[PDB]
Nucleic acid binder design. Structure first.
Ligand SMILES: [Mg+2]
Ligand SMILES: [Mg+2]
Ligand SMILES: [Mg+2]
Ligand SMILES: [Mg+2]
Ligand SMILES: [Mg+2]
Ligand SMILES: [Mg+2]
Ligand SMILES: [Mg+2]
Ligand SMILES: [Mg+2]
Ligand SMILES: [Mg+2]
Ligand SMILES: [Mg+2]
Ligand SMILES: [Mg+2]
Ligand SMILES: [Mg+2]
Ligand SMILES: [Mg+2]
Ligand SMILES: [Mg+2]
Ligand SMILES: [Mg+2]
Ligand SMILES: [Mg+2]
Ligand SMILES: [Mg+2]
Ligand SMILES: [Mg+2]
Ligand SMILES: [Mg+2]
Ligand SMILES: [Mg+2]
Ligand SMILES: [Mg+2]
Ligand SMILES: [Mg+2]
Ligand SMILES: [Mg+2]
Lengths: 151, 180, 62, 205
RNA sequence: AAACUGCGAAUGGCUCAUUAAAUCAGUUAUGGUUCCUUUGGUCGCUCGUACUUGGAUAACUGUGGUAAUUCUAGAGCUAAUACAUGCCGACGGGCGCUGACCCCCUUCGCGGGGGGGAUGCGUGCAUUUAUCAGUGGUGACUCUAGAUAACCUCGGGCCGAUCGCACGCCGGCGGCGACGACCCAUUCGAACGUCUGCCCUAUCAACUUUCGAUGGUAGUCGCCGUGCCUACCAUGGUGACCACGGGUGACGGGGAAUCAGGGUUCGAUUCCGGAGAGGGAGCCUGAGAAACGGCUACCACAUCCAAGGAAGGCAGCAGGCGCGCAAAUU
């Protein structure tokens, strides 16, 4: 309920729910065991994943992807896409002739697991690289740090 | 029985095609009337169909049954087959041999002659003949099978024996560290 | 009005003299009966066995 | 032929690119293999590396796991009930991965009644045949009757499943993609998903 | 000699038309894949005619056709490491489920417990699926290995119907090699991704999305990751940090010329990468081509003809014509 939006049934592919039991254990509770994995670089997998009820296959924690590659950081600008955000990375490109930098930026589309929330435009997000998720989406959000003005 | 085509333009007849005249066909390997230059290549060619008309250059005829009178060309003289059987079983067939008869004895020989050169008798090398060589190769490769089995047995026994000497020392380390 | 019949034609292997053995020799060896062939086989087999134990004695001699 | 390449496409911004090279072998797409229920028909394709892809045009049997009681039997496929992707695909009865399908209850009910010695999906009319009564009522030895009796505590079935047997048809879903694989194989729908999909197909009316 | 078979012809050689985040360079990834070969691993782990199996075809013999070709028909033969077909052997079993019956302990007996067991059914690696448990390995697997239930493609998977050289041993045994082979691993790679980097232009300021634009969910296709493609949803994505569009006498690099320091200009050209074989498109074969010294069309060109038809591809080497200020020996 409320977890199943879509036409197809929404599962957690590696977990078998329908394991049968006594009618004494059916009255106790239904808690389908989460599959969550510890992602490797020392990001503690958020509390909101391991307890949480949502299902997203492309999330790094609760789903099937592996984080390997570059690890980048950026700031959140535009989130109107479902389970993805657009972050911008700024930097200084050095022009040799003039001996100075010019500003530049690049926009990355990057996927965001529904465990993180309250992720608010203009805050720092550290992402890590995944295998291609979509046409423009090659990355994945590993940890979210708030903007400098949080209360 | 009707067999071969040729037409005034020289094309063959391919038994499948149901037309009269030309048909352009894509021929692949295994088809009639094309032999491929390179592996797995197809050609488009011109093929005259399988229906017989006054249009044909030439018509090839097989003779299925001989009725009465003997024709000058096709009947009176009989031409032998050169090259009797090269395979063991084909020979056992020609001469009706039990498995226990020597094939070596019965093989047809070619009576080869030329003017100025000594008269020869040729014989083809028999293939699929049981023989000391063939029989040997068999027990050879079986012997290799014995070898492999032996090797897996000895290796298994060995690594099993080695695993225990690691295991009792892993038990010693764990137990001593724990009791401490 | 229609044709319901599919003709079944037969293939026959005739006989021809093979160069070096004329049809008389082919038929001479073919029509040879079991007594004749069994005699020839056992005789050649025993001649070969004798030559072979002779060559085993000729292996141990050298 | 059909190119599944990425370079016929707009950029992230959407400016069309002019293709630098003409189409390459390895980017090839093949035609769709739609798979229908009928007597078995299968076409081998040779693919990259020279390996055989087994393609399924008509299928009949598929084998399925009844996961609760952990068995798998080789069953006959009947019909395509539901497909998340396309309604058109239900209509022509096409077998794809994750479409949902009706199977013969039969070999399951047989296994079950052999394991637990209990009635399954039988009418309340209770009418029986000799083989049935000799398998179900049977005869026991002391150690035997204790075994079977010990399992009788375990075997009870979700009312939904129970009903399915009574109808002769089970609801199942296909995990293997016959298109490339060559077999349509899968698992019986049990519990929550089963109730869910039941809700979708009652909703289809 | 020939011919069948096997392998190679995907390299190399040439040119620079296209191509402006494309190619390409450094950087990384494949935990998201394919890999002829080479090197090592495996190759009696499966419990169910073999001292040898079936048919055909080429060279060859002959009869032929057509103006014409590296065209080919019909009739005879005959091979295999070509095609197919298909066993003994180990092999006695072991292990799983089944379990007629039997024993023992215990019990007043029912019962409770420990066993033992004829009978069938399953029995390996690959394949596809589901479930269980948690030997070895990572920064991290839905990894590797294990156990359970089944599955297994007639357009079929593994298990050698093969070859040589030495000849020896107690009618039996065997030494060295050659090919093969499913599958690991390896090598050469290949293919897609990551981060950053390109010349001129505003007399191009908004662009993309009914025909995929951006993302979601399930699939199809593919060697796999992916709007690659379909179905259904969402309304996104890019842009003065110059998108989008146009231009380039634009293949990108390594480099070259010139230079105090800083630059400017050039890089078709011998190394590395990319593209292309008159223009487009589409496939066979294969480990590997969307191949052009393979093929099939259409367009443009052009050769032969007995007028029916046939054959083409120098941006390989030479050489010839044309173009041109401009470039070598059949
Ligand atoms: Mg392979
Ligand atoms: Mg050849
Ligand atoms: Mg080679
Ligand atoms: Mg090897
Ligand atoms: Mg000839
Ligand atoms: Mg012939
Ligand atoms: Mg999708
Ligand atoms: Mg997908
Ligand atoms: Mg669509
Ligand atoms: Mg140019
Ligand atoms: Mg340049
Ligand atoms: Mg250059
Ligand atoms: Mg030059
Ligand atoms: Mg080059
Ligand atoms: Mg090319
Ligand atoms: Mg030219
Ligand atoms: Mg090859
Ligand atoms: Mg081409
Ligand atoms: Mg050429
Ligand atoms: Mg070439
Ligand atoms: Mg030239
Ligand atoms: Mg001049
Ligand atoms: Mg000059």
């Amino acid at each position: 309920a409320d977890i199943q939006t879509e036409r197809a049934y929404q599962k957690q592919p590696t977990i078998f729910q329908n394991k049968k039991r006594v009618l004494l254990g059916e009255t106790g509770k239904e808690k389908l065991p989460r599959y969550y994995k510890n992602i490797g670089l020392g990001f503690k997998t958020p509390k909101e994943a391991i307890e949480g009820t949502y299902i997203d296959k492309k999330c790094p924690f609760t789903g099937n992807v592996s984080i390997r590659g570059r690890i980048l950081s950026g700031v959140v600008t535009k989130m109107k896409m479902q389970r993805t955000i657009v972050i911008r990375r700024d930097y200084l490109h050095y022009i040799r002739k003039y001996n100075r930098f010019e500003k530049r930026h690049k926009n990355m589309s990057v996927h965001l697991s529904p465990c993180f929330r309250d992720v608010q435009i203009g805050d720092i997000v550290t992402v890590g690289e995944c295998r291609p998720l979509s046409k423009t989406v090659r990355f994945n959000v590993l940890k979210v740090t708030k903007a400098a003005g949080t209360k | 029985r009707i067999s071969g085509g040729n037409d005034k333009q020289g094309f063959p007849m391919k038994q499948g095609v149901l037309t009269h005249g030309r048909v352009r066909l894509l021929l692949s390997k295994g088809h009639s009337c094309y032999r491929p230059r390179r592996t797995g290549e197809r050609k488009r060619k011109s093929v005259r169909g399988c229906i017989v008309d006054a249009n044909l250059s030439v018509l090839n005829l097989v003779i299925v049954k001989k009725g009465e009178k003997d024709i000058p060309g096709l009947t009176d003289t009989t031409v032998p087959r050169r090259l009797g059987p090269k395979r063991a079983s084909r020979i056992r067939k020609l001469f009706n041999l039990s498995k226990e008869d020597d094939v070596r004895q019965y093989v047809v020989r070619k009576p080869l002659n030329k003017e100025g050169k000594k008269p020869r008798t040729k014989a083809p090398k028999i293939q699929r003949l049981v023989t000391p060589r063939v029989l040997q190769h068999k027990r050879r490769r079986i012997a290799l099978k014995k070898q492999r089995t032996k090797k897996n047995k000895e290796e298994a026994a060995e690594y099993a024996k080695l695993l225990a000497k690691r295991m009792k020392e892993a038990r010693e380390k764990r137990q001593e560290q724990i009791a401490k | 009005x229609x044709x319901x019949x599919x003709x079944x034609x037969x293939x026959x292997x005739x006989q021809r003299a093979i160069t070096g053995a004329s049809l008389a020799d082919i038929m001479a060896k073919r029509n040879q009966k079991p007594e004749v062939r069994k005699a020839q086989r056992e005789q050649a087999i025993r001649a070969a066995k004798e030559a072979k134990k002779a060559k085993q004695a000729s292996k141990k001699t050298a | 032929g059909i190119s599944r390449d990425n370079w016929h496409k707009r950029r992230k911004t959407g400016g069309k690119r002019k293709p630098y090279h003409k189409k390459r072998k390895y980017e090839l797409g093949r035609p769709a293999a739609n798979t229908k229920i009928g007597p078995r028909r299968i076409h081998t394709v040779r693919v990259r590396g020279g390996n055989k892809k087994y393609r399924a045009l008509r299928l009949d049997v598929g084998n399925f796991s009844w996961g609760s009681e952990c068995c798998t039997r080789k069953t006959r496929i009947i019909d395509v009930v539901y497909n998340a992707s396309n309604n058109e695909l239900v209509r022509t009865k096409t077998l794809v991965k994750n479409c949902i399908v009706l199977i013969d209850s039969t070999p399951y009910r047989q296994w079950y009644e052999s394991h637990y010695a209990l009635p399954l999906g039988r009418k309340k009319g209770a009418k029986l045949t000799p083989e049935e009564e000799e398998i179900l009522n049977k005869k026991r030895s002391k150690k035997i009757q204790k075994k079977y009796d010990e399992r009788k505590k375990n075997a009870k079935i979700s009312s939904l499943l129970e009903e399915q047997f009574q109808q002769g048809k089970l609801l199942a879903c296909i995990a293997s993609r016959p298109g490339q694989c060559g077999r349509a194989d899968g698992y019986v729908l049990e519990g929550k998903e089963l109730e869910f999909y039941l809700r979708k197909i009652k909703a289809r009316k």
